[PDB]
Every structure is written in structure tokens, then in C-alpha cells.
Symmetry: D2
Subunit: 238 residues, 4 copies
């Protein structure tokens, strides 16, 4: 059918939506017809999200959420339920190597567990996990990226297996080197070395992540689950 | 003249093995998205069936006879398409060629040699246009036991590696190369199963059902689009959560 | 040969852990095996003595910072620094189990690394869990634990490599243990039919791989997970 | 006079044994007690192999083999059968936009050889096939492409063949080297060498002997439950 009908009738929760990849996802799910709730860690972030949605003709809301807190999670979901409805599309974009991976996976799990009750009841759902962008400094940066990706992949596949019988899919998107504020002011030598390892020869656009998410949220992705889609211009780091 | 804003309009898509099943659903999905579609089969009747199926669904294009194992068939088929329809810039390779666990070698070797032949031939046009999409379709699970697993895991491993390598080679030209790896989709093999076997098969699939051909096609249609321009070298599994390697 | 080396093997009172303890001892290491109880520890100490292996049995709870620190201090004072460390002890449930096991691996590994850093040599070898149950939940849990094991092992290897410490893992498939022994004949048969070699693995066959990874000739292997599964791959 | 060697009584065929990794594997299997047949593509290679085996006290032979030729394969194996015995340990270390043809041909060669030696293993109900992957051949994107493609084909092939032959207690495994100290790496500029080392957690190149040791373990009885596996030997440098 028509693109702006793809998600009509669905409420999407997108964490970390005030800028960058998260904002582009919020706008793309809106354009596909979802009601969109974007989150930020501050009140002004939340308000910016609400304004950006309105400016682009997307219905929904901006909210304050801290995915590391049980209380923030439970309160936020109760707010959404009462005022907008049950979020059946959930995009986790809000985030040395050990602590970071362990904490991010704990956060994914907390949020996922909380939104699954609604999806179990509806017998339908989409959980999409967004991995971290390539950039960070070092052999340490490489270590950290490969570890986070490996944890993201394994988690996503496990959770998909658990929830599959309820027609809930769980997938992940693993970005490579994407043009965000974080990557834009990386020293020129690191940026160049990164470009030289990307077959397409350019950075990815936030919108190019968002499009993949939008597809995974759609009905035609209903038999994709447990998958991690790399969006990296052909640069594979393991 | 009619200019579409967010569609495959103006693109010519070649879909090999389009007379039934997955290939046919892909041909119809790319047509619905606005491409001109050339579907192929190894026989005149398959080609005719394709041409009729396109016309019934309002899709412009053609059914052609193509044998991907033959240099002559490949070159002739591409020359024909060039002259009459234009340069195919979306190419979907879906044509591949008691099941025992020794059949993996010949099948994987023949199919990769065919993927390579076709891909090489259509790359010239994509290089010249500085745009392209090559999308390789994997083989479905062909049988229920050990041999079935062995042959499916081998074909999927060859497909993944080949796709990633080719993507690296052509990336600088803004040509993406991806693959779609199906799991269990509705087939004769699954239809002719005893009820206990069918139920045990479904119990190995987290979603609890077989996949539809259309559900493969939708993933291919996305890969062909502009918004998948940064996806390359990837193999998207479409298997309801059933992962076998 | 491992003469002159002190090896710590967690979970050594039976099965895979015990076979690893005896194998490293046969290769000449001084061996400290651990159990969660005083009787387990004592059984370990008796087994080592019966096989002529110098070392000790100790009580260790890898989930406790105090147990870890105390245990390592005990070993340092009485036997020396453990430079070969084999982690074989482990604790909708896939999440908590994996998350806790990786937290334990990390705790122990971080503690034993001081001594390896000081020696400029080390071997950490993580043992994966055997397939724990038949069918989908068993597959989910096993694949998840294996995936977390592989990624963790690779990341740690990258962090400690410059100190000539290797970090590797061994991922067993179906091994002849109490779990597989208490299976009904029909289940056992169906299981064998999914294993190309057509038999269950022996605990000793895990121990031999570990014994090799502990050796000098494995010095360029790091970050690797060796599957010991008779050709049965699940993920 | 009597020593119990872990491969005593076994005949090992090692392809590509005249230098480097293949030679170190031939010497290692010999030290472990096997009778060793090393091959090369030329008569002088073969002779060099035979001299090296003799200098190290290893029984066996150097032979000319071209793994791309059915005639050379069948003739060479028949020769070995008649004069030395059935090779029950086989180590494939011989190889020849080019990624395709190289990988595709090497896997076709592995298959030809493997198929030919399997009848003897089937008869004995015991075997070891060990496939050696290519070292990283060049710095840069093409080098990465070719290396990742070869490794991916090697892994998939090795796992499939293992599945096919498992019921006969024949194991099939691969060893995937990273950067090993040989002529290619020995002659890089100091800045490139230092940057290469900085991508290897262990901070050094691997030795040929360190690949040979892993092979020697895989050939042993204690590796009997390892099959289908690809052991990376790369100092922690993982490229895919
Ligand atoms: C947080 C520990 N961890 C994990 N996984 C993890 O924590 N959980 C996990 C991993 C795989 C599958 C399911 C999981 O549940 C968290 N993967 C890692 C990879 C590299 C370093 C650490 C990793
Ligand atoms: C037919 C031999 N073969 C090949 N042959 C091959 O040419 N593979 C290949 C070529 C280019 C790039 C990647 C490749 O494999 C992943 N790949 C296989 C994978 C699994 C089982 C057998 C395979």
C-alpha cells in the first residue's frame, strides 16, 4: 500500500530521539504513519522532540526517560499507556568495554521486558535495537565496538527466540561510520583512515539508518526476526 | 512525461528464476514499486508464464529464457535487454540449480560460478551508470534431516562470503551487493510432510509458521530502494528466527 | 609440558573440570581445583594426591568479591601465582544466567591478571556450558551463553594481549556427563543422530584441548573459541 | 629405540611442504612420529623436501603433486599407497577482482584431494583432514577482501565436509593463520610494519612453527571430538 499508511494505527516509542540517528528514526516512523513518542534525558530535550514532531506533521509526544532506571521506565510507560496507547513498535537507541556493554544490555533488557506485556496482549510487536556508531578512539575503540556489536547480536537473537510465538519480532541495526555530531569533529586523520576502510567511500547518513528501521517496523518484515542488519557501506569490523 | 518521486520508476530490474515461488513474488514486488521487470526462466514455457503474470498485474517488462550457466545465454540475454528495454541496474539472482549430505559441493560450486558470471556481465552497465543493486537470493531448506541441514548451511555460507567480497570490490561505484537468506518457506517438500513432522518443524521456528514468498520479496524490494543505499555486503536472514549454520 | 606453572581450575570436583585438573597435572602443573563446598574442596585435594599431582582443593564462590580476593591471597602465600586459569564454574532465564556468568568471568579474570601481568605471561581459558536441555529453550540458552562467551573472550584477549597473556574459550557440544547419562534411550538416540561423529564427547576430550591451549605451542592463539562438539553446530 | 610418539604408525601427506608453513608442518608431524610425505609442484621442491626430512631424521618422501590435476592426484596417491601406505593424516597447504577465481579454484582443489584420500580413511575408519588457510597476502582493502573471502570459503567448506564424513571417525578441520613471519611481511617499510603490529594484540608476527603446533594437536587422538572447526591462529587480529 502507500508509504504513509505502512504504520498507520501504531504507536512507536523511540528512545534518544532529540538529535541524530534517534531523531531520524522518529521522523521516518512518523512519515510512515505511526504515532511517535520520542524520549530524551532532559525536559528541554523532550520539548524539542515534541516541537520537531509537530513541525513535520507527526502526531505524538516528547518524554523524559532514563533507561537505566526501573522507576523512570515504569512511570514513562504508564504515562504513555494512559495518554497515547500501548507502544507496539519500540526502537532502543538510547545508550571500559565490559561496563558499557553490560550496562547497555541491562538497559535494553529492562525496557524490552516492560514493553513486552503490551505486545503479548496485542499478539503483535516490533522491537528494534540500534547499535553504536563506529568512531571511538583506539585499539580500545575497536575492542569496544566489536564487543558491543557481539553482545547486541546475541541478545537480539535470544530475545527474538523467546518472544517469537507471540508474533513479536526483535531485530537490530548495526551502524558503521555515520555522519553525526559525534563523528563530525573527530580529528581529520581518524576520519580519513575510517573512509579508507569503507567500500562505498563515504559516511552513512542518519536517514539511511532510519530507513532500515522503518522497513523492519513494517508488515513486510514480519518474517525477519533475530537478525542484525549491518548498515556500514561494506566496512565490516569484528 | 510522468516523474515519480519515491519509487523504482525508471529502473530496469532483471530477476532470474521468476516463473514461480520466490522469484515470481520478487518480480511482482519490484513491478509494484515501479520498475520495468524482466523475469527469466530456463524454458520457453516458464518465460511465457512470466510474461503473462507481469501483464496480468500491470507490470511492464518481459519474460525471457536465460541459462545462467552459459556465457552465450548470458551475453545474448543482456544484449537483448539493452537494445529493447535499457540497462538492468537492479539484478536479483534467484536462479540456482533421497537428498544426501554429499550434494553441497556441486550445488554450491555451480551456483556461485553462475552468480559470478551474471554479476560480472551486468556490472559494466552499473559501473557506467555509477549506480546499482545486486541482490542474491539464498536457497530454502530443501529437506528435513541431516543432509538438508548440511546442504542449506553450506549454500548459505558460500552466499554470505561471496556477497560480502563482491560488495567490497564494487562499492566505490555506488553499487550495493546484498543477499537475502530464506529459512523454511511454503514448498512441495513442506506440503508433503506428515502432520507430526510438520508440527515438529514449526516447533523449531520461533514465529511458529512457514514464511511466505511475498515476505522474501518485501525484503528484496527494500534493498533495491534508495534508502538501503548504505547497506552493502549484508545478508538479511528471513527465517522466522530459525538459525541453522 | 607445564612444569613450574600453577594452574587454577574452577569447578574441579567432577566432570569436565576434574578431567582438566588431572590433565594439567599430568602435564606437570601445580594444580588448584575449586568447588563451592568444603567437601568438594576436600574431594579435589584427595583426587589430586591420588594422581600424584601437587596443589590443592579450595572453596571458591566466583560470584563473591571477598571469596575471590581471599582465595587468590591464600594461593599466593602457599603455592605461588596462578598463571594458567581455567574458568569452568557457572551459576526467559537466559538473560540472568548469561549476565551473571559473564560478570563472574570478569571478576575472576581481573583478579588473576595482576599476577600474569607481573609474570608477563598467562593463559586464561574459558569453558562454555554443555548443551543443558533438549529442544528450543535449551537451544536459546546455549546459543546465548556461547555468544556471550565468544564475544567476551575475544574482547579480553584484545585488552591483555600486549602482556603475552592469551585468552581463549572451549565450547563443548554434547559431552558424556550426568546430564546426558540420565537421558532416556530414545532421546539419546535422537541426539546421536544430530552429531556427525555419532557419539557423545568425553570429558577428557575437552581436557586435551585445554591442555594444548595452555601450552607454549598455542602462544599465537588468542581470542579464539574452539568448538569441541563432534561436528554438531548450534547457534 | 622405543619411544611412544603421538602419531606413531601414521602416514601423513602434507601438500606444499617445501618452505614456510608447509615445511614447518612436515617437520612437526615427523617429530610427532608420523611417516611424512611432503609435496611440491616441482622436482627440485620435492627433492628439497626429501633432503629436509632426512636432515631432521624423519622417514618419508618428497613428491611432485599438482592438486589442480586429477591425473597428478590419482597417480601420486597410488604411488604413496604402494610404497609407503595409506595416508590417514592429510594436510592441505598447497594453493595457486581475482578473489573469485582463487578461492573457487582452491576449494575445487581441496575437494579433489579430499575426495581421493577419503576412501583409505573410510576403509581404516579413522582420518584427519586439516586445511590450512592463506596468510594475509597484502596490506590494504584488496588484501582484506581476498583474505576474508578465502577464510569464509575455507570455514564453510571445512564444516560441510566434516558433516559428510563424520560417521567414519574422520575429522575435518582448518587452521586460519593471520600475519605470519615470512618474506611478504619481512620486507615492509618500518612505519607500515609498526602499524601492522599495532593491529595485532600480541604485538608480534606469528611463527610458522606456531601454525605447525596447532596442526600437530589437531592430528592427535586428543583432538578426536573436534571436527568442522576452524582454529584462528592470528594473535588476536580478527579480520572478516
Ligand atoms: C555484557 C557482557 N557481554 C556480552 N553479552 C552479554 O552481556 N549478554 C549477552 C550476550 C550474548 C547474548 C545474550 C546476552 O544477554 C546479555 N557480550 C559481550 C561481548 C563482549 C564483551 C562483553 C560482552
Ligand atoms: C563449493 C565449494 N565452496 C565454496 N567455493 C567458493 O568458491 N566460495 C567462495 C568464493 C568467493 C568468495 C567467497 C566464497 O565462499 C564463502 N564456498 C563454499 C562454502 C561452503 C561449502 C563449499 C563451498
Amino acid at each position: 500500500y502507500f508509504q504513509s499508511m505502512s504504520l498507520q494505527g501504531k504507536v512507536a516509542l523511540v528512545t534518544g530521539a532529540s538529535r541524530g540517528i534517534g531523531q531520524a528514526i522518529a521522523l521516518e516512523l512518523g512519515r510512515l504513519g505511526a504515532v511517535v513518542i520520542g524520549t530524551a534525558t532532559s525536559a528541554s530535550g523532550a520539548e524539542k522532540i515534541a516541537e520537531t514532531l509537530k513541525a513535520n506533521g507527526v502526531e505524538g509526544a516528547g518524554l523524559v526517560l532514563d533507561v537505566s532506571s526501573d522507576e523512570s521506565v515504569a512511570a514513562t510507560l504508564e504515562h504513555i499507556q494512559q495518554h497515547l496507547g500501548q507502544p507496539l513498535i519500540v526502537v532502543n537507541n538510547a545508550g571500559e568495554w565490559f561496563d558499557v556493554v553490560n550496562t547497555n544490555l541491562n538497559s535494553l533488557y529492562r525496557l524490552s521486558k516492560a514493553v513486552l506485556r503490551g505486545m503479548t496482549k496485542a499478539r503483535w510487536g516490533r522491537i528494534i535495537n540500534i547499535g553504536s556508531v563506529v568512531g571511538a578512539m583506539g585499539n580500545a575503540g575497536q575492542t569496544n565496538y566489536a564487543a558491543a556489536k557481539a553482545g547486541l547480536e546475541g541478545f537480539t537473537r535470544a530475545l527474538a527466540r523467546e518472544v517469537g510465538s507471540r508474533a513479536i519480532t526483535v531485530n537490530a541495526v548495526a551502524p558503521g561510520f555515520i555522519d553525526t555530531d559525534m563523528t563530525r569533529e573527530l580529528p581529520e586523520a581518524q576520519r580519513e583512515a575510517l573512509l579508507g576502510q569503507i567500500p562505498l567511500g563515504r559516511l552513512g547518513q542518519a536517514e539511511e539508518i532510519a530507513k532500515v528501521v522503518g522497513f523492519l517496523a513494517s508488515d513486510g518484515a514480519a518474517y525477519v526476526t533475530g537478525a542484525t542488519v549491518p548498515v556500514n557501506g561494506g566496512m565490516y569490523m569484528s
